[PDB]
Every structure is written in C-alpha cells, then in structure tokens.
Amino acid sequence: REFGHLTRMRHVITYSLSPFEQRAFPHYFTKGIPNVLRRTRACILRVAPPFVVFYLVYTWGTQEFEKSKRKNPA
Amino acid sequence: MTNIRKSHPLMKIINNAFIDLPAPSNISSWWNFGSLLGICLILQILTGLFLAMHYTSDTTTAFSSVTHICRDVNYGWVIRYLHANGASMFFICLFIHVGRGLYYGSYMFLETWNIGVVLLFTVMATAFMGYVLPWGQMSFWGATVITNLLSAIPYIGTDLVEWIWGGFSVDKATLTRFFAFHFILPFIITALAAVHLLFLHETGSNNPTGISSDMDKIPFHPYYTIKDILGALFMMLILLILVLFSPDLLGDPDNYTPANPLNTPPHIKPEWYFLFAYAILRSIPNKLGGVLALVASILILILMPMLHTSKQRSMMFRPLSQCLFWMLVADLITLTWIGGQPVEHPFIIIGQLASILYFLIILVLMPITSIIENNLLKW
Amino acid sequence: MTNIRKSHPLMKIINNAFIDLPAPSNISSWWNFGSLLGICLILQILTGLFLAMHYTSDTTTAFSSVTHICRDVNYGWVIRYLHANGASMFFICLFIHVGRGLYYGSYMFLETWNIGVVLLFTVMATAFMGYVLPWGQMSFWGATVITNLLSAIPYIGTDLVEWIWGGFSVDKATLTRFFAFHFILPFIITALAAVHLLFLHETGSNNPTGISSDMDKIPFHPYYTIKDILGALFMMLILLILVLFSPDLLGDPDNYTPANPLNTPPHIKPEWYFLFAYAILRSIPNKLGGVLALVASILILILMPMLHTSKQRSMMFRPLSQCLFWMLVADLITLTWIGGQPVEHPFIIIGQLASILYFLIILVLMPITSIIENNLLKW
Amino acid sequence: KGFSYLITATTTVGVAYAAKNAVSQFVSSMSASADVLAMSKIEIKLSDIPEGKNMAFKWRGKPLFVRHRTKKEIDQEAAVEVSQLRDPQHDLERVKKPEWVILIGVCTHLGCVPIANAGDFGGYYCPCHGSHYDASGRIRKGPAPLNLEVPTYEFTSDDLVIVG
Amino acid sequence: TLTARLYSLLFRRTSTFALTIAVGALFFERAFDQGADAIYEHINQGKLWKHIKHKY
Amino acid sequence: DLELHAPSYPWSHRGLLSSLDHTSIRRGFQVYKQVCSSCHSMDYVAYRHLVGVCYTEEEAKALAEEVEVQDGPNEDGEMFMRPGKLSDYFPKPYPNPEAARAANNGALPPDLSYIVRARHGGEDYVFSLLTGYCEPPTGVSLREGLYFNPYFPGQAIAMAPPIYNEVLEFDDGTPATMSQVAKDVCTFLRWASEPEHDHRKRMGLKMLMMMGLLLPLVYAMKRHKWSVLKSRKLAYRPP
Amino acid sequence: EMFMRPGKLSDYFPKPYPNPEAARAANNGALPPDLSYIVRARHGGEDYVFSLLTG
Amino acid sequence: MLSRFLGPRYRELARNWIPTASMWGAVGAVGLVWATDWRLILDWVPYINGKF
Numbered sequence A: 001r002e003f004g005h006l007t008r009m010r011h012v013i014t015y016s017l018s019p020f021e022q023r024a025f026p027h028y029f030t031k032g033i034p035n036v037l038r039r040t041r042a043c044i045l046r047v048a049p050p051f052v053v054f055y056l057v058y059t060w061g062t063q064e065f066e067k068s069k070r071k072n073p074a
Numbered sequence B, C: 001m002t003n004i005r006k007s008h009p010l011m012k013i014i015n016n017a018f019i020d021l022p023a024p025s026n027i028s029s030w031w032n033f034g035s036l037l038g039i040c041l042i043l044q045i046l047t048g049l050f051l052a053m054h055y056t057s058d059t060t061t062a063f064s065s066v067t068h069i070c071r072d073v074n075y076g077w078v079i080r081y082l083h084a085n086g087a088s089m090f091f092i093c094l095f096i097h098v099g100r101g102l103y104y105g106s107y108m109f110l111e112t113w114n115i116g117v118v119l120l121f122t123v124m125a126t127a128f129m130g131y132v133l134p135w136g137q138m139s140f141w142g143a144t145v146i147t148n149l150l151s152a153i154p155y156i157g158t159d160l161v162e163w164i165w166g167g168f169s170v171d172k173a174t175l176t177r178f179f180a181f182h183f184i185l186p187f188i189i190t191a192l193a194a195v196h197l198l199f200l201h202e203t204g205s206n207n208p209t210g211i212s213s214d215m216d217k218i219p220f221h222p223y224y225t226i227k228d229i230l231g232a233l234f235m236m237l238i239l240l241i242l243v244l245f246s247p248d249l250l251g252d253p254d255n256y257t258p259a260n261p262l263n264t265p266p267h268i269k270p271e272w273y274f275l276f277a278y279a280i281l282r283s284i285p286n287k288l289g290g291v292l293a294l295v296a297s298i299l300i301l302i303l304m305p306m307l308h309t310s311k312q313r314s315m316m317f318r319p320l321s322q323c324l325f326w327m328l329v330a331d332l333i334t335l336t337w338i339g340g341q342p343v344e345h346p347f348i349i350i351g352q353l354a355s356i357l358y359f360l361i362i363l364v365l366m367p368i369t370s371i372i373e374n375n376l377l378k379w
Numbered sequence D: 001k002g003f004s005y006l007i008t009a010t011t012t013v014g015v016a017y018a019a020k021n022a023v024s025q026f027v028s029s030m031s032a033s034a035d036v037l038a039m040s041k042i043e044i045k046l047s048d049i050p051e052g053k054n055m056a057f058k059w060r061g062k063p064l065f066v067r068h069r070t071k072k073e074i075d076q077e078a079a080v081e082v083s084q085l086r087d088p089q090h091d092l093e094r095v096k097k098p099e100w101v102i103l104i105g106v107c108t109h110l111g112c113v114p115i116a117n118a119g120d121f122g123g124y125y126c127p128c129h130g131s132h133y134d135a136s137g138r139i140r141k142g143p144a145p146l147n148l149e150v151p152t153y154e155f156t157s158d159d160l161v162i163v164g
Numbered sequence E: 001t002l003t004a005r006l007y008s009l010l011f012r013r014t015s016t017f018a019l020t021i022a023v024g025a026l027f028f029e030r031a032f033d034q035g036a037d038a039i040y041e042h043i044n045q046g047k048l049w050k051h052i053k054h055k056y
Numbered sequence F: 001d002l003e004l005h006a007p008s009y010p011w012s013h014r015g016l017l018s019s020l021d022h023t024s025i026r027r028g029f030q031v032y033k034q035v036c037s038s039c040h041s042m043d044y045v046a047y048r049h050l051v052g053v054c055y056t057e058e059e060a061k062a063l064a065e066e067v068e069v070q071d072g073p074n075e076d077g078e079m080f081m082r083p084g085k086l087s088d089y090f091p092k093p094y095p096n097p098e099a100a101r102a103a104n105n106g107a108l109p110p111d112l113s114y115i116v117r118a119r120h121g122g123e124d125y126v127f128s129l130l131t132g133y134c135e136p137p138t139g140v141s142l143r144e145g146l147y148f149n150p151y152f153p154g155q156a157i158a159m160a161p162p163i164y165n166e167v168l169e170f171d172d173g174t175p176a177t178m179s180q181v182a183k184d185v186c187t188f189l190r191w192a193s194e195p196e197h198d199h200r201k202r203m204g205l206k207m208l209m210m211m212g213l214l215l216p217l218v219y220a221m222k223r224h225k226w227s228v229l230k231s232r233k234l235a236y237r238p239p
Numbered sequence G: 001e002m003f004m005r006p007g008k009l010s011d012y013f014p015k016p017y018p019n020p021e022a023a024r025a026a027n028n029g030a031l032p033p034d035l036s037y038i039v040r041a042r043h044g045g046e047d048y049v050f051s052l053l054t055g
Numbered sequence H: 001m002l003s004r005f006l007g008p009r010y011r012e013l014a015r016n017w018i019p020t021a022s023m024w025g026a027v028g029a030v031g032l033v034w035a036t037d038w039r040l041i042l043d044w045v046p047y048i049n050g051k052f
C-alpha cells in the first residue's frame, strides 16, 4: 500500500505550482460564493424535507401534550 | 545510509501510519472526524486522570468530593466541565463518524466496521458508568433504571442484575466497581482504536466518490496533518464555547442534588446521547422485547455490509438513497426528542412510529431502494 | 488461498510474535523469567482491578476499606494477598531478568536494554505508589520519607516536594493522586513491554553461548510455549505458597495499623525489593548525594553496553568475570540485608563498603577484568 | 517567503500562548487546593502548659511542639555548652517567648517525630535513632546533626498564638 | 520590503525562527492578558471586586 | 398537574460576558445570614470563599468570629464551643437532617449550595418562587400549615413566606423592599452555585479572542499547503 | 434524638470510649490499641501477645 | 570514539554548528523562563515585570 505499487498510469501529466508562488485565497469570495450557492441548490431539495417534517412533528407533538394536559370542562 | 524515519522500527510504524500513508486526495471534512474522536479520546483520558486524583468513589463522599473539585481545587471546575462536555463532544463526533461510514459506503471495510461497532459499544458503556460517578439524583436513578433493564433477560435475570449491583440494589459497592470499570475501559478503547487503524490501513480509505483512489493518493503529512489540525481546532472551539459559556447546556440540573434513594425525580432520562436507545426502550411494551430492540438498534450496523445491494459503493451518485438516509437521520433526532419527553399519549405513538421507521429504513427501505436505483440505471 | 495465521494482520502479528518466531534452541531456563514478568503483570492487573472495585481512596476510609476487602468481600483476602505477594514475585523476576541480561551480555541489544531500564523505573515507581494505598503506618511514613528526599534537589526541591504532596505533607490529596497514578501506570508498562518485545524481535533472542544462533533455530510454538507454560506453573506454585501459607512473610507487621501522623514506627524501612537502593542512600551522608546515588544505582544499567570490553559477548567463557558477577550479586544481597537493619555501627561501615564495592565492580573491576581476559586468549 | 512564514510564526506564537495557558491549568490543579490553602493560622493558645508539660498538635500535616520551657532551661540551657552543642543557638534566639517555646515535630536527622517528655534531660527523645533533644529543642547527644527549626511564631494578643 | 528584511534577517534559520517565536510569545502573553483583562473590566465596570475594594 | 415556568428575568449576569454584581452578592449574603440561615442550610461554601468576592478579609474573619462552632475532643473528650474561623463552612441550622423536618412541618429545607444550579429554570425560578406568593385560587383548599405558590411544583410549599419588605436592614442602606431582597439573595445563590462565574466569563473572552486570531491563521496555513493540489492542472495525452 | 436499642447481628463490637482522646484521658494517657489486628500488627504475633500478658 | 571524533574536520564541524547549537540553547533557556514564569529572570525585562 506504500507508494510504488498503487496503480498503473500512462500518458498522464500533472502541472503544479509552488505554494509560495500562489495566493492561498485566490478569488475567495468571487468564485467561492457561487460554488457554495450551487452546492446548496444541489443538496437542499434532498436534505431539507426530512428536517422540516421533523420540525412539524415536533411542534405538533409539543402542542398535543398541552391540550391533553389542559383542563377538560366537565 | 538510510533515513531513520523509515528504518527505525517504531519510527517506521509511525511513518507508514501517519506520515507517508497514502490517503485519497478528495476526502471531505467529514473524514476529519476520525481524527477528532481520537483527540477527544486523549482529551477524555488526560483530563479524566486529573479528576481521579481528587475523586473518592465512595457514596459518603463522591458528591462532596466532586463539589470539592469544582470549588476548591485550583482550576478544578475547568477540568470537570471540560471532561463532561468533552464526553458530549465525543458522542457527537462518534455519531457523525457512523453517519459518514454509512453514507459513503465505508462498511465494505468489514473488519474496521466491526471493530468500530465494538468501540461504539465500549464507549456507550464507559459513558454510562461515568454518569453514575457524581452520585447525583439523575446519576443514581438512571443507573437504577438501566441496571434494572437487565432483569428482563430470561432465567439468569435478577441474579445477573444483583451481580452487577454487588448487592440488592445500587449502593457503595456499585459505585466503586463502576469507578474501577470506568478507569480501565478507555485503555481498552485505545487498544481497539489501534486495531481499528491497523485494519483500515491495509486497504486505504474510502473517498467520497466511492471509487478506488489508488490513482490519486497523496502523502499524509504535508496535507492531512494540517487539515486534521484545523479540524481539531474547530472542535476545540466548539468544546471550549460549551465549557466556558454554557457548561451545563447538555446536562440535567438535578444531578447537582445529592443522590437520595427515597425520592424519585419527576423526570428520569439518561444522558442526551443515550435517549435514542432509551426511546426505543419506551416503544416496545414487552420488557424483554424492549431490551432486545435496544441492543438491536446499535447491533444493526453489523448487518449493513450484507444489506448493501446497490452496485455503487458510495451514496454520492444515488439521490433516492440520499433522501432515505436523511429521513433516517431525522428519525434519529425524533427518537432523541421522544426519549427526552415523558411517556404520554402525544409521545407514545410517535415513539412507536419512529422506532418502526428507524428499523424499516435500514432493513427494508434502503435495500429495496438500491434495487430500484440499479434497475433505473440500466444495471 | 492463504493461511489465516499468516495472512490475517492480527494473527500475522501474533504469529511473528510467539508462534513462528525463530528462537535459539539452547536458551536456558533463565529466559523463562521474561514471560513470567509479563504473566505476573497480567495477573497483577487482574488482581488490581478486583482491588480497585472495593477500595476507597480517602484518608478516613482507606485502611478500613482494605480490611473490608479481607474480612467481608467473598474471597477478598485471596485477591488482596495475591496482589501483595505478586508484587514481590514481579520484583524477583525483574531482578533475575536484569541479572540474566548482565550475565549473558543481552545488554548488547541497546534499544531493548534501554527500554528495559525505563520499564524498571516505571515498575519501581508503580510499586512504591501502590504500597502507599493501604494507608498503614509503614505506607504513610515511607511515603513521607521518600518524598522528603526530593527536598534535597537544588533550587526547585521544596516546591517539587510540596507539589507532589499536593500540600505540605502526605495526606488525602497525596493518597488520591497515588491511587490514580497506580491505576494508570501499569497500562503504560504494558505499552512499554510491547515496545520492548518489538525491539527484541528485530534482532532475535541471545543464547547463553553468545554466538549467533541463526544456524540453529526452532519455532517458538511447539517448544517454548510449553516451556514457558511450565515456568508459569512453577512461578504460580511459589506465589500460591506465599499467598496461602505465609501471606505476610515479606510484609512488615507495622503496616496493619492506621496511619497516625503523630507517631513514627520505631523502625522505618521500605519493602524488601527497595532496600538495595535504600541502604545505598543510607551510605552517602550528604542528602543530595543520597538522591544521586539512589538514581545512579539503577541508571548505571545504561552504561553496561559502553563499559563492555571483552571480545566475547557472553560470560559462560569468562571465569574471572563470573566470580566478579557473583561478587556483585552477593553484594546486592548484602545491601538488601543492611537496608532493613537500623543505622548503627557496624551497619554504617558495612553499608558504605557494600555500596563502594558495588560501584567499583560495576564501573572498574568488570572492564579491567575483561581487558585482562582478552590478553589471556591472545586477543 | 517572509509573508508565508509570518503566517506560520504568528500561528505558532498563538499556539504557544494556548499551550502554556492549558498546561498551567493542569499543573496548578496538581498543586495544593484552596481548602488546604487555609493553613499556618492555627489558633491554639498557651493556657494549658506549665513547666515540663508538652502538648503537640497537627499543623501543615506535621506535628508542632507546644511546650512551656522549664524554669531550669531558660536560665541555664541558654548558656549550657554555648560553645558548640553540635549547633550554635541561644534560648531566646529560638523564640521571643520566654515561657512558651514552640517547635516543629520533625526530628532533624532523617524525618521522624521525637516523643515529648523524654531523654537524658527529658525534653524530646526521638524514638527512631535515640537522639534526645533538649526541652527547648537543642541537640547535644545523638546521631541528629541539627536542631529543630522553629516555625514563624506570629504570637497574637494574649494566650492565642499563630505558628506559620 | 519590510517583510523581506524580516525574513532574511530573522526567519530563514529555523533556530532563529524558534527564538523569534519564543520572544514573541513572551511579549504576546503580557500584551494579550493586559488587553483582555482591560476589556473585560471595561464591560463590567463597577461590577467586580477590584472596583469596590476602595469602599470597604 | 401543570407547572408554571419562570419568566426569563433580565439578570445583570445574563449577558454573554457579564459578571455578577458583587455588591448585590454582599447584600445577598447579608440576606442569607439573617433570613435563610435560620432554617435553610448551606455547606459546600465557607467564609473563606467570601474574601475577594463580596467581603474583605477583615470583614470575613469578623463574620466567621460572630458565630459559634462545635470543635473536636477537649482535653478530656468534650464538645467545646469555639469562635468560628475563616476556614469554617457555613453552620447548619439543624444538627441532623431529620431534625430539620421535625422542626418544620416535615419537609427539610434543601441546601442552597447548588439550588440555583439544581432547580430547572435557574435564578428566575428561585427569584420568582420568592416573589410569587399569592392567595390560593377558589376551589383548591390547602392543608393547615401549607402555603400556595404557583411556581413551586405541586403548588403547595412548606415555606412560611420568607421574604417580605422591611425584613432586614442592608449595611449599604439600599431600600429593603421585598423585590430588592429577593433579587440580591438570588444573585448570591447564583454565586454560591457557580463561584467561578466571573473567571469563567473572563477566560471565555480570552478564548473567543484567541480563537478569532488562531482559526484564520491556521486556515491560511492549510490553504497555503493545500494550494499545491487545489491549483494542479491535469492533462491526458494518449498516443 | 440518638435513641437506644439492643445490638443485632450486623452490628460491630462495642466501643467503650467515645473518642480516642477520651480513651487516653481515662487511662494514664496511653491509647489501648485496637485488638482487631494486634496479632498480625506486632512483630511476634500470638507469641508476643502471650508473653506480654503473662510475662 | 575518544580519538575518531577528535579531528580537524570534526573540530571545524563543531565550529560550524556552534552558532546554531548555542542559539538553540538560548531558545531553550528563553522557553523555560517563559513556561515556568521565572520571576528571578523576568523581573529585569521591561514591560514584562509589570505582570508581577
């Protein structure tokens, strides 16, 4: 698993630059915000609905406890 | 003639386990939790020892000794609340780690997965015995309830329960043996974590895409050391916020009352990280069935490598499976909340439905949905 | 298909450890003690746990708790005296192991030798901290004297002793810290012993003859497993004799008395295994000289690889060195006998002479004898 | 390179501050706690001692030695073998109190507690290795090479006294 | 540049780097403690013991 | 059934970086001294903790000297009285725990060393419970010797109304109105439960500033080292 | 009140003097050592104890 | 060992590493002073003595 017998590649070229030549925050907000918005758009329609229905269930149960708790006119 | 880093035996092990270990280039922030738990473990041990040097595991003095720690020991309160909230953080990171493993199809690592399940069980046992030590009202009565749980097992039953109790019920002897078991267990956890890492290293790691990353491995030291250091700094931020701004946020106030066995507190709930099991306990009317469901809730993680049927290791390219997983997570929070609440008409039915859904998603919905996805994707 | 023993990583480590490890066929019985130490360690840990499950760590209820272990806990006296005498067996095996290392030149394995010295330091520290726990008269006054020794350190002495005391004398704080460190330390010893075995396996064991045994090797399993089993049975026989027939043979009766800080025992002495160093510190008049000689008495094992000058590794073929080694052993027994005896003529002179002769043999007589040895064999 | 390494240097400085203020927490925890930080102010009183009677109490985890110096020693022992006496000291040099000499209860040979009202004179005889101590704490015969150190006696008004 | 001078005066050598870090921490501890304590006292002015010792 | 949760009062220390008003702590200790200590008990805190918080050393030692405390065996084994010292915990009004119930109707007064941190709701509860006494509503009769308090669970407390206007005289001279007494004693009880409150907030401020400094820098270091990989440009040139 | 009642099986052996200081005061000033461990706390054991009592 | 390390090239290496080793020792001394909060030394440096 050590380096040397991981896999086999051919005709693959990797260009890279020194960390001392690039800026560690290249367009942090110019490109970061659109990417975060795109990721949120991709994920929200799958992650939100279970949590929103959990919130509905929690509120409903919390209100249900009181009226069963409340005084019954009799 | 040769670098010491990869020639000295201990240095060789450290090198090929933390420095030159080939790791996937695109592991997300979730993988960082694997480090945090370990750090939490050390933070649990190193802080915990410093409580053991002023804690007397005696019924007549345990609570008084803890109050002495928090009021008279120099910076003792920091150690005590750091320990408690660090245990809470440990469980948070543990749950997030299990979620990461389940999501990105990591349970194909089998041996590592089973070792992780064993570690999880040991950690829950450790926290259970730990909560008893302050000998508060909630500590005492939660210990009473959880130990009385074991009376449901057939035949042996009460004999096993009294064997654990060291008597007719929880008392001085029970406190002392809980303290000793609590001291020993985390070192077993450390050895098991070493075995977990050993098993994991033979195959590498699961990247978020789920495909083999042998074509993009990078050395661990330059990148992931600093990445996990940033993660540990974030975890320290959260933990220190909890300790220094709301120390008892995740903690019942009644534990600040000396344990009086003649008064049942109005509410008897375990620590926040046990409620999901306890709620399942409340769901099953039968006591034996309740205990079996409680243990099966955690044991079901072993069945996961057998219940995976989709031809894709990860869940990154599987939308309906993603929706099912997030429904499972929401069900887990629902179970936690239900366990927090008492047992009345609004909550009993919700607990039953939540438990049924929690088992159904893992055992039924997820595999059938994986079949549906495989069929939908022409394979 | 692969053999699980040689393919499963855990079973692979076990296999390379003590299943198919190439060991010399001619290693004498003196090697068995190594395993015995580990066995003793394991036994100790077990007994320690069963002692920590009924022992409070408060000055008010320490000693009484121990009596409750002996008088009330079902089969409690057996566990207590098993621990007490297993400590003595542990130190007997430790001393015999050190003697074996000195004799057959096993200290030439440098890393294992240094790791062993660290293990020795940790073992004596652990045993000393354990002896304080019963809180008898001997425990209290011995802890007082030993920690008062640290006040001889220049500049930072008084602060260090007050800090370790957790106050201004041996009291509740010191007892609780000693309990916590006594709990944790043996696990550190276990880790260090694992490192010891790791370092040993990269070079293989040394035979009594000193010559490399690479040509004549046997698998560890079919022979040395049963040989160490027999050794463990014999050590169990001796330890059980001590526990069942004379449990307090190697124990000062004064320990069976509540620790009263207003009354010293007429005679104050450590346990037997600590006398050899204790008498040494008694020899040096200067208070700091006593501490320096105390630390040197054990740290001088570090210089053994460097002081070696004979062309032959072992001592089977060096009669003069053999007489020197047995002189050293007799001198060690002399120091052990003297330490218990009160300081008074002639024991002052005999102790001073014994310490001087010990250091003279270790540093001067042995290397000079080896240099003379080489000339007699034309090298 | 200066900017990039300045980031690292400031990070390391912050980490050093945090590491000190974290390790110091534990180290100070392992020091003496606040409850035992209420010491050295024992409110014992001298109205239970005439010449020869030799009470001893507990203080700082060690015995202290409250003894009315006998009518003999105050006048003779102040000049009995003042030459060497194995240690040079005069009686009122030990304590400003001329009738209520107080000491610590650790015999200054190896670490012990000398039992009171015994010895060839009869002040303090160390049970360990003999070494009788004079009724004011002086050493004349015995393996003990030094006299009892006298704690700072902050004698309050009237009978009530403070040691340390 | 000031940064370049700082680098190739006091940053190039890792041992000089360590000395710089040590002295910087020495001064930073005092500066940070003073500043944080001053801020915290300013927020709770009149509500701490040190602000009312004069009265009693 | 039903219980009335205490409203969230605007305490001086409610703020994220706020500290207990130590003058109010001194007044609350006065209240405990001459009101609550008569029947209620506090053990885990002692006169020593008073110095540097609400009383000076001279005042604290005078306060300790005022009370009488039982000591150890006498010269013959007697239980001799002794003027209390700074190292003495606050005296317990009733010797044995059952004697407290016997003197009262039968409910023992809980110790206040943690009552703020043990009761769900915090000071808002302990405050309101004192300033919440009212005549019982119609249709619910209370036993003789019992008192109706909406905030106390069960709505039936065994307290004689402890705090009423003009009960004690503060040393400072502030008005002794019932609300003032309740607020000051509640602040003192909060201090009793959490003596390290002010120090905790100070360290929290230090932690917030230190992390707001470190986290951007460590993130910058991570970005620096990872920028080799986040800017790499791959290329594929098969023959 | 700390009332009175006959001892039962679970009760430990009676203690004559309330506090050890009272024990010292009642005698010349010495403390009668607890006999629960005397044999195995003194060098000599039953031999020493017999010699002390009858010697 | 007693003579193998005693050589002109070894002496020159010692001279080469004297600045590095010496100011590493200075690093350690200052770190020890800072960590232990050694008043005996810190009482002389300005603006730091105000802490005490």
Ligand code: HEM
Pocket: B041, B044, B045, B046, B047, B048, B049, B050, B051, B052, B055, B066, B080, B083, B084, B087, B090, B123, B126, B127, B130, B131, B132, B133, B134, B182, B183, B186, B189
């Ligand atoms: C696996 C990691 C650990 C977890 C999850 C854990 C959990 C806990 C918990 C929840 C408490 C209760 C804290 C409170 O209620 O205030 C506790 C207390 C305690 N733990 Fe642990 N613990 C861990 C490791 C350790 C270790 C290694 C030790 C021994 C060195 C230890 C010793 C103690 C002691 C002495 C207490 C009592 C102190 C107190 O009252 O808080 N713990 N632990």
Ligand code: HEM
Pocket: B030, B031, B032, B033, B034, B035, B037, B038, B041, B094, B097, B098, B101, B106, B107, B109, B112, B113, B114, B115, B116, B117, B119, B120, B123, B189, B193, B196, B197, B200, B204, B205, B206, B207, B301
């Ligand atoms: C004691 C707590 C635990 C510790 C200290 C621990 C430690 C680690 C560490 C450091 C990693 C590597 C980092 C990573 O991949 O995230 C890891 C990976 C893993 N752990 Fe754990 N773990 C713990 C609990 C668990 C649990 C409860 C499970 C699930 C049953 C588990 C299963 C896994 C799996 C499957 C991986 C591989 C993930 C991957 O690399 O893709 N672990 N563990």
Ligand code: HEM
Pocket: C030, C031, C032, C033, C034, C035, C037, C038, C041, C094, C097, C098, C101, C106, C107, C109, C112, C113, C114, C115, C116, C117, C118, C119, C120, C123, C189, C193, C196, C197, C200, C204, C205, C206, C207, C301
């Ligand atoms: C914690 C106690 C110790 C344990 C559990 C331990 C364990 C072992 C074991 C199992 C062996 C192999 C069997 C043998 O050759 O004896 C061994 C070898 C050895 N140990 Fe130890 N050891 C301990 C203490 C020490 C000490 C105190 C030293 C000396 C400083 C030492 C030095 C050695 C040496 C030199 C060998 C190699 C002997 C040879 O190859 O012939 N060990 N150790």
Ligand code: HEM
Pocket: C041, C044, C045, C047, C048, C049, C050, C051, C052, C055, C066, C080, C083, C084, C087, C090, C123, C126, C127, C130, C131, C132, C133, C134, C182, C183, C186, C189
């Ligand atoms: C390295 C192995 C160990 C050694 C050499 C050792 C040594 C000792 C010794 C000499 C005593 C005093 C016995 C007596 O005076 O009666 C003692 C007591 C004790 N040890 Fe250990 N011990 C070891 C491991 C442990 C461990 C692992 C634990 C915790 C699980 C432990 C817990 C105790 C306790 C609670 C006592 C007090 C009971 C007693 O003194 O009889 N020990 N130990």
Ligand code: FES
Pocket: D107, D108, D109, D110, D111, D112, D126, D127, D128, D129, D130, D131, D142, D143, D144
């Ligand atoms: S200790 Fe008193 S004479 Fe040796």
